């Protein structure tokens, strides 16, 4: 009721600070990406379009700032009530589609490292068109409504009944197309990334154990340090053979263990000098069959060193963390619209926490630039 006025008077100032922070940071991001990076990779095109969508949304943000400040007294008219809400919904849809495409591109780049810039631009245009199409409900049904006989006007959503089933659809098309289907694609594209990293790390971790113990054999001539070092090498050779990133990889390690078994043979008798001679041959086998598969493991793990992967992970994680309040509360509204819940408290919590969730959901719009300078060590110099 009127008690909510005290908290809600601070909503417009949060909108204003978000607007200024975003309109500065995302503009800087645009100029940085276009100039110091020159859009030389596919990951740059998607991020630049994310920044452009942020610009487009933040341009129409201050209308809602005064709309909440004036306590729902939208004066800008119908031609802006039908475009500001459209801009908000389009921002949501375009941002989530761009994030899904970014995650798919990261998976393809670090799991399948095999002109795509033009393909990126085409996909970007398709994403913008699809987001504009999904913003059609705000294009059509959003309309200025005169409250009572007074002169108060609100950018109300006109559920014209007896010709529309949408009330169920709109609350669900957001929760499905804007958060659910994108989540499955992104989670799948990042679980597959983890599997490819785990296989690459296992080969690198086990081959390290071969390297350190190989150094131990040369430096020690105790006739038992060779046994201890060789035993840990054979166990590492077997483990690395199972870290599949086909016959060449298996045949490459079958000979490798055979040399360790040969070296372990004379370590038993006491021929220390002959022990490291057989262990020295391990380098020859490595350079032939294993080094080819050893560079890919480091190359794949080197993609985590890229600042792009750090930035995209931060952007994707925050977007779905900040949208989990509103998307959950949106589903609650959908259930309450069909009569599933008939609780005053449920209706009250949905109708009073939703103002905060919208601010929370679009809070990420002014935090995308802050993820560039925080994790983009290169971006700091710009």
């Amino acid at each position, epitope marked *: 009721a009127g008690r909510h006025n005290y908290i809600f008077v601070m909503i417009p100032t949060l909108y204003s600070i978000i607007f200024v922070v975003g309109i500065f940071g995302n503009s800087l991001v645009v100029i940085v990406i276009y100039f110091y990076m020159k859009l030389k990779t596919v990951a740059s095109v998607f991020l630049l379009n994310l920044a452009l969508a942020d610009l487009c949304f933040l341009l129409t943000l201050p209308l809602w700032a005064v709309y909440t400040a004036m306590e*729902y007294r939208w004066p800008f008219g119908n031609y802006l009530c039908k475009i500001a809400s459209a801009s908000v919904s389009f921002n949501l849809y375009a941002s989530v589609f761009l994030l899904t495409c970014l995650s798919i591109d990261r998976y393809l780049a670090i799991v399948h490292p095999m002109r795509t810039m033009l393909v990126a631009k085409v996909t970007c245009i398709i994403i913008w068109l699809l987001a504009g199409l999904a913003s059609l409900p705000a294009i059509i049904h959003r309309n200025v409504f005169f*409250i*009572e*006989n007074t002169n108060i006007t*609100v950018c109300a*959503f006109h*559920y014209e*009944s*007896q010709n529309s089933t949408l009330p169920i659809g709109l609350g669900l098309t957001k929760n499905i197309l804007g958060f659910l289907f994108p989540f499955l694609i992104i989670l799948t594209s990042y679980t597959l990334i983890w599997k490819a990293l785990k296989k690459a790390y296992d080969l690198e971790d086990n081959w390290e154990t071969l390297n350190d113990n190989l150094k131990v054999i040369e430096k020690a001539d105790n006739a038992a340090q060779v046994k201890d070092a060789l035993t840990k090498m054979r166990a590492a050779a077997l483990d690395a053979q199972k870290a599949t990133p086909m016959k060449d990889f298996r045949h490459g390690f079958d000979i490798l263990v055979g040399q360790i078994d040969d070296a372990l043979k004379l370590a038993n008798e006491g021929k220390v000098k002959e022990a490291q001679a057989a262990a020295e041959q391990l380098k020859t086998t490595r350079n032939a069959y294993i080094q080819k598969y050893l560079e890919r493991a480091r190359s794949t793990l080197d993609k985590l060193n890229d600042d792009i992967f750090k930035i995209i992970m931060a952007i994707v994680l925050f977007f779905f963390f900040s949208w989990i309040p509103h998307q959950i509360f949106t589903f609650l509204d959908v259930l*309450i619209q069909l009569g599933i819940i008939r609780d005053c408290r449920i209706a009250d919590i949905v109708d009073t926490a939703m103002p905060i969730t919208i601010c929370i959901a679009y809070f990420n719009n002014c935090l995308n630039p802050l993820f560039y300078g925080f994790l983009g060590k290169k971006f700091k110099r710009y």
Partner: nanobody, 112 residues
Framework: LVESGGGLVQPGGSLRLSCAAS????????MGWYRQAPGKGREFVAA???????NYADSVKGRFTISRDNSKNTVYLQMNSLRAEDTAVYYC????????????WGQGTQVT
């Protein structure tokens, strides 16, 4: 889902425009009636709910009376002196003003 009702009548007569609504669109939503005169836009005629006092248009306050019913989930509009330019089509809207404002309209009923 917003229903409607009513019909035509001779000048000076009276009839009860009815409009039933679902449990959601009645309990928390300000149920009201808007008249859309031919060659004109919709204008406020009445309202009975929404946690606010009932409101009539200044041109209809004399001979209009909107009523409700807690049992059958309906709202009735009781016109008394139907003359002048009251000939129009009446929409039964149920608007709830929030951070996602909604206006549930309904099928119009021509009245003459």
């Amino acid at each position: 889902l917003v229903e409607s009702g009513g019909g035509l009548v001779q000048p000076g007569g009276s009839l009860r425009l009815s409009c039933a609504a679902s449990g959601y669109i009645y309990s928390r939503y300000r149920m009201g009636w808007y008249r859309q005169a031919p060659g004109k836009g919709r204008e406020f005629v009445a309202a009975i709910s929404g946690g606010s006092s009932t409101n009539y248009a200044d041109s209809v306050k004399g001979r209009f009376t909107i009523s409700r019913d807690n049992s059958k989930n309906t709202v009735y509009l009781q016109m008394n002196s139907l003359r002048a330019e009251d000939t129009a089509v009446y929409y039964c809207a149920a608007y709830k003003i929030d951070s996602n404002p909604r206006v549930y309209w309904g099928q119009g009923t021509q009245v003459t």
